[PDB]
Design an enzyme around this catalytic site. Structure first.
Site, PDB file in Angstrom:
ATOM      1  N   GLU A  35      11.169  12.520 -58.732  1.00  0.00           N
ATOM      2  CA  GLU A  35      10.027  13.113 -58.039  1.00  0.00           C
ATOM      3  C   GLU A  35       9.763  12.413 -56.712  1.00  0.00           C
ATOM      4  O   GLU A  35       9.466  13.066 -55.708  1.00  0.00           O
ATOM      5  CB  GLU A  35       8.788  13.036 -58.936  1.00  0.00           C
ATOM      6  CG  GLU A  35       8.824  13.992 -60.142  1.00  0.00           C
ATOM      7  CD  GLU A  35       8.664  15.451 -59.776  1.00  0.00           C
ATOM      8  OE1 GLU A  35       8.303  15.771 -58.620  1.00  0.00           O
ATOM      9  OE2 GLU A  35       8.907  16.287 -60.668  1.00  0.00           O
ATOM     10  N   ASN A  46       3.640  22.120 -50.869  1.00  0.00           N
ATOM     11  CA  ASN A  46       4.177  23.276 -51.567  1.00  0.00           C
ATOM     12  C   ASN A  46       3.942  24.549 -50.775  1.00  0.00           C
ATOM     13  O   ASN A  46       3.119  24.604 -49.858  1.00  0.00           O
ATOM     14  CB  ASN A  46       3.565  23.435 -52.954  1.00  0.00           C
ATOM     15  CG  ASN A  46       3.641  22.175 -53.767  1.00  0.00           C
ATOM     16  OD1 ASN A  46       4.718  21.633 -53.967  1.00  0.00           O
ATOM     17  ND2 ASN A  46       2.498  21.696 -54.230  1.00  0.00           N
ATOM     18  N   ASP A  48       2.427  27.290 -51.623  1.00  0.00           N
ATOM     19  CA  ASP A  48       1.069  27.822 -51.674  1.00  0.00           C
ATOM     20  C   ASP A  48       0.073  27.029 -50.835  1.00  0.00           C
ATOM     21  O   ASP A  48      -1.122  27.351 -50.896  1.00  0.00           O
ATOM     22  CB  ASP A  48       0.553  27.871 -53.116  1.00  0.00           C
ATOM     23  CG  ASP A  48       0.306  26.485 -53.703  1.00  0.00           C
ATOM     24  OD1 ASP A  48       0.698  25.471 -53.081  1.00  0.00           O
ATOM     25  OD2 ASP A  48      -0.289  26.411 -54.797  1.00  0.00           O
ATOM     26  N   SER A  50      -0.656  23.881 -51.392  1.00  0.00           N
ATOM     27  CA  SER A  50      -1.006  22.676 -52.113  1.00  0.00           C
ATOM     28  C   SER A  50      -0.041  21.572 -51.701  1.00  0.00           C
ATOM     29  O   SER A  50       0.942  21.814 -51.004  1.00  0.00           O
ATOM     30  CB  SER A  50      -0.963  22.920 -53.625  1.00  0.00           C
ATOM     31  OG  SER A  50       0.338  23.269 -54.069  1.00  0.00           O
ATOM     32  N   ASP A  52       1.840  17.737 -53.200  1.00  0.00           N
ATOM     33  CA  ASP A  52       2.125  16.828 -54.312  1.00  0.00           C
ATOM     34  C   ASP A  52       2.030  15.392 -53.798  1.00  0.00           C
ATOM     35  O   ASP A  52       2.524  15.084 -52.710  1.00  0.00           O
ATOM     36  CB  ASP A  52       3.540  17.047 -54.855  1.00  0.00           C
ATOM     37  CG  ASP A  52       3.713  18.392 -55.555  1.00  0.00           C
ATOM     38  OD1 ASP A  52       2.725  19.108 -55.767  1.00  0.00           O
ATOM     39  OD2 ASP A  52       4.863  18.733 -55.881  1.00  0.00           O
ATOM     40  N   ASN A  59      -0.044  17.455 -58.274  1.00  0.00           N
ATOM     41  CA  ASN A  59      -0.332  18.600 -57.412  1.00  0.00           C
ATOM     42  C   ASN A  59      -1.824  18.755 -57.148  1.00  0.00           C
ATOM     43  O   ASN A  59      -2.632  18.715 -58.081  1.00  0.00           O
ATOM     44  CB  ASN A  59       0.212  19.880 -58.051  1.00  0.00           C
ATOM     45  CG  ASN A  59       0.268  21.057 -57.072  1.00  0.00           C
ATOM     46  OD1 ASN A  59      -0.374  21.047 -56.022  1.00  0.00           O
ATOM     47  ND2 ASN A  59       1.034  22.083 -57.426  1.00  0.00           N
ATOM     48  N   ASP A 101      -1.905  18.432 -71.637  1.00  0.00           N
ATOM     49  CA  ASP A 101      -2.550  19.722 -71.464  1.00  0.00           C
ATOM     50  C   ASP A 101      -1.808  20.835 -72.192  1.00  0.00           C
ATOM     51  O   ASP A 101      -2.116  22.007 -71.982  1.00  0.00           O
ATOM     52  CB  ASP A 101      -2.701  20.038 -69.972  1.00  0.00           C
ATOM     53  CG  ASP A 101      -1.403  20.428 -69.301  1.00  0.00           C
ATOM     54  OD1 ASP A 101      -0.313  20.163 -69.852  1.00  0.00           O
ATOM     55  OD2 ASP A 101      -1.474  20.938 -68.164  1.00  0.00           O
TER      56      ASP A 101
END
Ligand SMILES: [Cl-]
Ligand SMILES: [Cl-]
Ligand code: NA
Length: 129
Positions: A35, A46, A48, A50, A52, A59, A101
């Site tokens: 990562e 990203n 969209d 967003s 990271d 994110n 989650d």
């Protein structure tokens, strides 16, 4: 900060990631390698809009506030800049919420594509833990 591989393994272990939710330490080191290349200051934008952040590339769409992801949530209740510290505590605490989650470590694309189903043990071999 750019962690060494055993240095990061030891820090993660101290912070309770070893076998957290059934994921052995080498999974977390492997995920961090692909990562962020072990760099706490890694950021990536990203599509969209967003971004990271940090060694686990968490994110802003869901997990932290960076003031620039409209309509996003802040589920870890932290500024995204806190994820870039040399102190990995905030990243670990937030990653613990993510992996719990329901979707486990599949939340991390690089883990799914480069670590899952491999001998992740090899990421901690030779380290004094
Ligand atoms: Cl392991
Ligand atoms: Cl990937
Ligand atoms: Na956000």
């Amino acid at each position: 900060k750019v962690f060494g591989r055993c240095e990061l393994a030891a820090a993660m272990k101290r912070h309770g990631l070893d076998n957290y939710r059934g994921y052995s330490l080498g999974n977390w080191v492997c995920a961090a390698k692909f990562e962020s290349n072990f760099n706490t200051q890694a950021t990536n934008r990203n599509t969209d809009g967003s971004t990271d952040y940090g060694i686990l590339q968490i994110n802003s769409r869901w997990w932290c506030n960076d003031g620039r992801t409209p309509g996003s949530r802040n589920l870890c209740n932290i500024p995204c800049s806190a994820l870039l510290s040399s102190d990995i505590t905030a990243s670990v605490n937030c990653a613990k919420k993510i992996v719990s989650d329901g979707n486990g470590m599949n939340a991390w694309v690089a883990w799914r594509n480069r670590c899952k189903g491999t001998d992740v043990q090899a990421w901690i071999r030779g380290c004094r833990l």
